Design a protein around this ligand. Structure first.
Ligand code: GTP
Ligand code: MG
Lengths: 55, 112, 99, 111, 51, 51, 93, 51, 32, 102, 55, 73, 49, 484, 157
């Protein structure tokens, strides 16, 4: 929850722990490489809500 | 259990009735809320032991009437229509001498 | 035919004919092909319903027994072939081409 | 086509049995299901991007309902929406501070 | 060497699971009781295949 | 073999397999490693895979 | 007990390195699940399992899942099986 | 495989690592390892531990 | 104009509160 | 909703009711043989009985020419609105996506 | 058979796509009728794989 | 027409569990369970092995691969 | 040579060792040098050509 | 190099198929030329002949039991005589005007050919024909899509009209059921008509059986028919059909409804002459036509739209669909089928599987690339035993015997007629490679055989002719090196 | 497997009517449904929804779901009638789970009938005694079933 200028200085400062990926790929999560941002947007909904049979 | 699988549609899966209680913030009240929802679901499913009027009905996908039975739709009132078509032919041949094209609205189709 | 899953019975003595130890040749629940003593019927029983005669309590392989090793007074010198540690290239059986 | 939905009482049938609508009303009695009256019978659209197994974004639950203009002004959306209590926003309100030591103690108490 | 490859060990395990499958033994297994989609749905289309 | 099916049985299979994921009864009155009375799962979370 | 594999939560971020270039960094954390199946409910093991949080590794946390059997009573006097009423409920209720 | 029935291990069983995709394993080493003008020991050795 | 624009009749206009020109047919003025 | 379900014409349930009412006035049998049990036109949709409703259409031009509005503003979901966008997908606790709740 | 459907219906009866499936058999000097084959798609699921890259 | 609904529900409840385990009995009950089983075994086996056979369960099942089938020497 | 890296493990086969061992078998000029090469050829797993 | 084209002379043309030969510069390497030596006033007589000749043009009385799974042809003048309606849905895709009009004589084709041979004298063979149809009125032919269903039905009219039998041939039932527009019947209350399908039916049926319908005396037909100045009142059944379809618009719309009803009344009373009725796609006549009933507000009459309690101009709606039994053409057919007083009409019909594909999901079809653009929008399952009163005949795909004869006719006689590779024979493979490959691509399906025959043009991965030209050029250069 | 178009073409510079190039909003694409979102000329809330990629993709997802629905309803040659448990045939006397509840159930594997119960369609002429007991006049005729063992034209006799 920071801007792009603050995120680089936390990376260049070494505070947070982030792994760099090649800038034309989709990282390492298979759900993001499959369908993009919208498929991972649906997978969190499947984890938070739709896996529970609500009463 | 036939009444129980219909009253709990997606809550029953692979022979196990699963209830996920998420109503209250603490888990102690969700166990109490889950217990009364199990007992309310069991009590309505127990109506099938009272009689056959509470047995849930079987949903059969029964077919439309076949082409053999649909062939008899032409012969519905066969002798009445064949008697009717003779005077409708006589109504047609007398009206052809008046205009060029005589529609079935001028022969048998009542509009007004 | 009235049983849904299976019916277990008393433990009878049997020998092991085969046991596919690979997870792909034998999925869960694992089966071991045994042949019983009284009638000789070859059956595939689950691995939970077999009992072996153990030799110890803490063993990973409990059926085989312990073996004593040979003792050497000057055990600091002992010659092992680096190329053939199991003595593979020597043959105990004599061939017809050794003449 | 255009028709009227019918109902047969178990006292009318020669063999009585529990119907599927009063089982729906019994299911709506237990789990407190809202029955929308003007729900059209013609508009039963499946989320084929998710439900069909031969699509790339295959999830067995309907992730979006096929309704153009499902906004906040309709009260049906309001009843089934998740309230933002104890969500990630509640983590954002109490943790994202310009000084993290002003969230774990007071400065006068530590000094 | 080993006897089969990684994809070969995957489908040779699926054939042993369907060879011992019983639908009454899939009582409370969950999705582990689903009996190898390729060979199970082939048996359900036997009315149309008819070798 | 080979596996050819009707598609609507395949449409029914793939939706039923994911919706019945956590419809599993862990503590069964049974044999060994499947059967138990209580089941404890401790999900450990760390930033590195070797950690 | 046996250790069960679980896939890591990995979420990437796409931000400017300045409109010049885009950086692709990801937050990620890895999971291992330990399945303990006991054929009895013992609070001495539940006490010992809960106290593993006090000697964990550096920057490593844990959460506990407990699936136990519990007897539930369906009281057919508090929740009776009754006939349906003479005037049944409708959609207006 | 199974260690109790393993003794002579099957090595390199032609398991294709090119069907799976892990292409971004690029590593960045320090400049001038074998250079005669650049010394082996130095404070630039602390750059080897930085992720 | 989405569903039933053809059902608008000339009696739906408030013609008593304006004055239109005699040549073209457009509204010339408004009444307070 | 988007289809405003039309008025119920009296004899339009089948072909025999239309033939007996409008086409052939001397048609003996009024409609198709209706069973004693309840038929379900909408399936598997449970509709309120006594309510005039319409079946899903079978032609493409009826789906085309029906007064159905298109999406104009930003679309909303009842639980995917705490997460703002697919690019601003918010996660409270970093659990795995294959994490099964016991 | 490719994913439960025959090869004439998967690749939409295109000869230049289905002849690549025959190419392992003719170069081997083998008859295709002596073998049964089922191909399972494990990549990105699409409603139609009628292209030369999928073939 | 044979037994009540309570007997049929009790019989199905035993045979639907995960592992059907045989109960321990008393000595005079074990004599009754064996002697009726000896009398009932004559009707289940074919007439080739009714009088003289090898074992109590010999011919009750249609196909059983015995170990004694190959080594006839 | 026994392969260790997976680059040379992709060029290792007992049927391809048949050609290499036959080339050394023809390079030999005498049978006592040939029978020593043949005995270790069949000691190792090698398809005989 | 070895041409043998200037020494080739043309054989004498006896039929239409022998005249379909292209010039010899086209098919010289496509169909190679051999030489035979006869002993005719000299020991060598060099006679250059073709390896392949056209299959023989035979009348159906000359077709025999030994010609099963063989190829025969019909004349073009026999094609215009016996088929004024046309052919099936996909039968004419293999017969351009340069090509011969070939037909495969299958084993099911031989059973139907001997059946019509007994229909021609049915009164003495009545117990034979009742045992063949198992007491039913006729046969229905069902199978998968693209098999020999409509290709067999056009052979039956070739079998029956060459035996001078009066035939009712519907070449495709989608002109009646899935037609342009539907009109209610003028003289039949509650019944409907396909007027554009009826005028084409009443035209071509008159020209086809003009030898028999001119001898057909009108038994139950009123003689006070409406007739303009200069036209003769019909005294024959040929004159009745020419009264119906030959008229001016819009007077042809109501004339066919009178003509079709009186045609079906005249045919149902004839108990002496055998009338074979062949319908392509009886499954379209066994369920609902794609027309729907009109809304009752169109016939009721309205003063205005704003106050009438109607929404006919506001929202569309689906009325109940009109069945095929309410059509005046199918009413006369179903009258002769169900009523047992007609042991005279034999309904040798078939079904069609020309529907669009749908396999769980469906997007929109691309307008340029759509093989199913003129396909039927039905998607309904059909069972010929339950939905028809006829005896079901199940035909499958080709076996390798008749697939070899059909592919030999497609490849060789296409290049002989100047429609194939011709001079580009060296780029395409030989016949044994094409028989092996197209049998894989089609699965010996007859529509797939014709479709992949045209898709033989775009084969990319055939390396037979590349390696053969490498071997022959290698063999040539070493042969001249031997001479050096 | 379906060969129709599902996704919408992306946004670029304005295409022209060329070879292998159609304009972005044409009457040929999606059956003319792009006329709701097209612009003829070569109000801010009525202009930006035509250019948003997520908005125009959602409308094609609705239209393709409408095409999926009408072809699934045109396949229906049947209808669902609630029949009680006693008058139902023997293959429906079992416990039938709901949709997506269990494994896709075979009908009766003991009688060698391996087919899904949810796609089972019964002919109406079989259940005339159940559906119409009040008529008593046999409103539908019995289905004429052909004799499979009778020597007919298909059996060379
Ligand atoms: N000449 C000839 N061609 C045949 C024969 N059988 C099949 N064909 C070819 O196979 C194709 C299929 O013909 P149809 O009979 O119309 O196919 P269908 O079974 O009617 O297909 P649907 O109408 O969709 O049910 C035709 O285009 C013919 O070229 C035959 O016996 N003789
Ligand atoms: Mg056809």
């Amino acid at each position: 929850n920071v801007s792009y200028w603050t995120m680089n200085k936390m990376v260049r400062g070494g505070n947070l722990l982030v792994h760099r990926v090649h800038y034309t790929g989709w990282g390492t999560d298979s759900h993001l490489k499959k369908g993009g941002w919208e498929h991972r947007w649906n997978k969190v909904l499947q984890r938070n809500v739709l896996q529970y049979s609500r009463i | 259990e036939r009444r129980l699988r219909i009253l709990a549609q997606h809550r029953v899966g692979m022979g196990v009735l699963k209830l996920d209680a998420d109503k209250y913030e603490d888990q102690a009240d969700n166990v109490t809320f889950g217990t009364t929802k199990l007992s309310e679901l069991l009590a309505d499913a127990r109506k099938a032991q009272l009689g056959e009027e509470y047995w849930p009905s079987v949903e059969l996908k029964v077919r439309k009437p076949s082409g053999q039975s649909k062939a008899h739709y032409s012969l519905i009132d066969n002798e009445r229509i064949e008697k009717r078509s003779r005077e409708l032919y006589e109504k047609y041949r007398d009206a052809k001498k008046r205009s060029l094209f005589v529609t079935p609205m001028e022969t048998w189709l009542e509009v007004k | 035919s009235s049983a849904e899953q299976r019916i277990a019975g008393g433990p009878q003595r049997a020998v092991i004919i085969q046991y596919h130890h690979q997870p792909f040749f034998n999925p869960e629940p694992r089966l071991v092909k045994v042949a019983f003593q009284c009638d000789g019927t070859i059956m595939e029983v689950p691995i939970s319903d077999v009992m072996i005669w153990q030799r110890r309590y803490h063993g990973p392989e409990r059926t085989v027994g312990d073996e004593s090793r040979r003792y050497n007074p000057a055990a600091m010198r002992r010659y092992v072939d680096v190329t053939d540690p199991f003595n593979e290239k020597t043959s105990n059986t004599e061939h017809f081409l050794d003449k | 086509g255009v028709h009227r939905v019918g109902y047969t009482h178990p006292s009318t049938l020669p063999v009585p049995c529990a119907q599927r609508w009063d089982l729906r009303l019994a299911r709506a009695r237990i789990f407190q299901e809202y029955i929308e009256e003007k729900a059209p019978g013609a508009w039963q659209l499946e989320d084929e991007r998710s439900m069909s197994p031969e699509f790339k974004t295959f999830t067995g639950y309907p992730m979006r309902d096929m309704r153009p203009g499902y906004g906040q002004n309709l009260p049906d959306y309001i009843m089934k929406k998740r309230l933002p209590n104890n969500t990630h926003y509640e983590l954002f309100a109490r943790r994202d501070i310009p000084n993290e030591d002003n969230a774990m103690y007071g400065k006068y108490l530590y000094d | 060497f080993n006897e089969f490859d990684a994809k070969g060990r995957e489908y040779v395990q699926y054939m042993r699971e369907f060879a011992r499958f019983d639908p009454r033994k899939s009582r409370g297994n969950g999705q582990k009781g689903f009996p190898f989609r390729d060979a199970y749905l082939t048996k359900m289309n036997e009315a149309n295949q008819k070798t | 073999f080979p596996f050819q099916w009707k598609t609507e049985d395949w449409y029914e299979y793939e939706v039923a397999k994911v919706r019945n994921r956590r419809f599993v009864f862990e503590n069964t009155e049974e044999d060994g490693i499947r059967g138990s009375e209580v089941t404890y799962k401790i999900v450990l979370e760390g930033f590195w895979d070797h950690h | 007990p046996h250790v069960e594999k679980l896939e890591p939560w990995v979420r990437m971020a796409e931000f400017w390195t300045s409109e010049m270039s885009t950086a692709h960094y990801e937050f990620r954390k890895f999971f291992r699940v330990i399945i303990c199946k006991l054929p009895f409910q013992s609070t001495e093991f539940e006490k010992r399992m809960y106290d593993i949080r006090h000697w964990l590794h550096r920057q490593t946390s844990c959460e506990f899942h407990t699936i136990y059997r519990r007897n539930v009573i369906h009281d057919s006097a508090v929740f009776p099986t009754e006939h349906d009423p003479a005037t049944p409920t409708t959609h207006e209720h | 495989g199974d260690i109790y029935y393993d003794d002579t291990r099957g090595l390199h069983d032609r398991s294709p690592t090119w069907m799976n995709e892990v292409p971004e394993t690029r590593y960045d080493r320090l400049y001038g390892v074998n250079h005669p003008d650049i010394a082996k020991i130095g404070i630039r050795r602390h750059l080897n531990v930085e992720y | 104009p989405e569903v039933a624009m053809h059902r608008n009749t000339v009696g739906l206009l408030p013609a008593h509160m304006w004055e239109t020109d005699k040549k073209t047919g457009k509204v010339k003025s408004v009444k307070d | 909703r988007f289809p405003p379900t039309p008025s119920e014409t009296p004899a339009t349930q089948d072909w025999m009711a239309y033939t007996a009412k409008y086409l052939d006035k001397q048609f003996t049998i009024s409609a198709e043989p209706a069973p004693v049990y309840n038929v379900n036109k909408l399936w598997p949709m449970q509709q309120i009985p006594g309510k005039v409703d319409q079946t899903p259409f079978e032609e493409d031009q009826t789906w085309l020419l029906h007064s159905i509005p298109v999406q104009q503003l930003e679309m909303h979901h009842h639980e995917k609105d705490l997460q703002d966008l697919p690019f601003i997908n918010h996660e409270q606790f970093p659990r795995s996506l294959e994490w099964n709740a016991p | 058979t490719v994913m439960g459907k025959p090869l004439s219906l998967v690749l939409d009866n295109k000869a230049w796509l289905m002849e690549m499936v025959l190419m392992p058999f003719d170069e081997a000097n083998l008859d295709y009728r002596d073998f049964d084959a089922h191909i399972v798609s494990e990549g990105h699921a699409m409603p139609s794989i009628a292209n030369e890259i999928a073939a | 027409r044979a037994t009540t609904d309570a007997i049929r529900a009790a019989w199905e409840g035993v045979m639907r569990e995960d592992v059907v385990r045989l109960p321990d009995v008393t000595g005079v009950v074990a004599l009754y369970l064996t002697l009726v089983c000896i009398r009932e075994s004559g009707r289940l086996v074919p007439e080739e092995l009714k009088e003289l056979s090898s074992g109590l369960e010999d011919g009750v099942r249609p196909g059983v691969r015995k170990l004694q089938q190959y080594p006839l020497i | 040579l026994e392969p260790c890296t997976p680059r040379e493990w992709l060029q290792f086969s007992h049927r391809n060792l048949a050609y290499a061992y036959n080339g050394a078998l023809r390079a030999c000029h005498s049978l006592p040098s040939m029978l020593l090469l043949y005995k270790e050829m069949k000691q190792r797993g090698v398809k005989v050509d | 190099k070895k041409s043998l084209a200037a020494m080739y002379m043309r054989p004498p043309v006896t039929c239409y198929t022998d005249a379909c030969e292209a010039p010899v510069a086209m098919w010289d390497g496509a169909i190679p030329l051999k030489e035979t030596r006869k002993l005719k006033n000299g020991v060598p007589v060099r006679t250059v002949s073709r390896t392949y000749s056209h299959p023989p043009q035979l009348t159906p009385t000359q077709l025999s039991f030994n010609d099963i799974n063989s190829m025969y042809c019909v004349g073009n003048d026999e094609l215009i005589q016996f088929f004024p309606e046309g052919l099936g849905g996909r039968v004419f895709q293999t017969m351009p005007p340069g090509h011969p009009r070939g037909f495969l004589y299958r084993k099911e084709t031989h059973l139907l050919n001997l059946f019509v041979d007994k229909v021609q004298h049915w009164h003495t063979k009545r117990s034979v024909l009742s045992s063949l149809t198992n007491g039913r009125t006729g046969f229905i032919v069902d199978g998968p899509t693209g098999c020999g269903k409509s290709a067999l039905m056009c052979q039956v009219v070739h079998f029956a009209r060459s035996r001078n039998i009066v035939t009712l041939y519907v070449p495709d039932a989608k002109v009646w059921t899935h037609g342009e527009w539907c009109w209610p019947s003028t003289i039949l209350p509650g019944f409907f008509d396909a007027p554009d399908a009826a005028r084409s039916f009443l035209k071509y049926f008159a020209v086809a059986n003009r030898a028999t319908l001119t001898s057909w005396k009108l038994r139950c037909t009123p003689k006070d028919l409406p007739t303009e100045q200069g036209e003769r009142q019909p005294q024959n059944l040929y004159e009745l059909c020419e009264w119906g379809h030959r008229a001016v618009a819009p007077a042809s719309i109501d004339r066919q409804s009178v003509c079709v009803k009186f045609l079906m009344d005249e045919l149902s009373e004839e108990k002496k002459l055998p009338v074979v009725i062949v319908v392509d796609g009886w499954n379209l006549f066994s369920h609902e036509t794609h027309f729907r009933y009109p809304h009752p507000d169109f016939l009721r009459g309205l003063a205005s739209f704003n106050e009438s309690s109607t929404d006919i101009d506001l929202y569309p709606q689906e009325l109940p669909r009109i069945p095929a039994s309410r059509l005046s053409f199918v009413r006369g057919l179903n009258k002769m089928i169900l009523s047992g007083d007609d042991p005279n009409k034999f309904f040798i019909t078939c079904t069609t599987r020309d529907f669009k594909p749908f396999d769980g999901i469906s997007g929109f079809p691309n307008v340029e690339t759509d093989r199913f653009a003129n396909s039927l929008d039905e998607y309904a399952p059909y069972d010929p035993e339950k939905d028809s009163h006829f005896h079901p005949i199940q035909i499958g795909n080709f076996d390798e015997y008749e697939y070899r004869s059909f592919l030999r006719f497609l490849i060789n006689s296409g290049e002989l007629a100047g429609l194939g590779w011709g001079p580009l024979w060296h780029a395409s493979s030989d016949f044994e490679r094409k028989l092996y490959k197209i049998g894989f691509l089609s699965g010996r399906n007859p529509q797939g055989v014709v479709d992949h025959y045209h898709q033989e043009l775009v084969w990319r991965y055939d390396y037979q002719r590349t390696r053969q030209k490498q071997y022959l050029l290698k063999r040539r250069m070493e042969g001249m090196s031997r001479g050096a | 497997v379906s060969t129709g178009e599902f996704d919408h073409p992306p946004f670029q510079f304005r295409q022209r009517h060329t070879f292998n190039t159609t304009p972005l909003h044409d009457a040929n694409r999606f059956g003319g449904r792009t006329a709701y979102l097209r612009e003829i000329g070569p109000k801010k809330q009525g202009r930006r929804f035509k250019k948003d990629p997520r908005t125009v993709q959602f409308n094609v997802d609705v239209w393709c779901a409408q095409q999926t629905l009408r072809k699934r309803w045109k396949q229906r040659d049947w209808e669902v009638i609630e029949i009680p448990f006693r008058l139902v045939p023997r293959e429906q006397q079992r416990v039938i789970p709901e949709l997506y509840t269990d494994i896709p159930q075979m009908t009766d594997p003991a009688r060698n009938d391996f087919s899904n119960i949810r796609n089972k369609v019964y002919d109406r002429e079989e259940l005339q005694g159940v559906l119409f007991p009040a008529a008593g006049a046999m409103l539908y005729p019995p289905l004429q079933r052909v004799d499979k063992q009778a020597m007919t034209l298909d059996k060379y006799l």
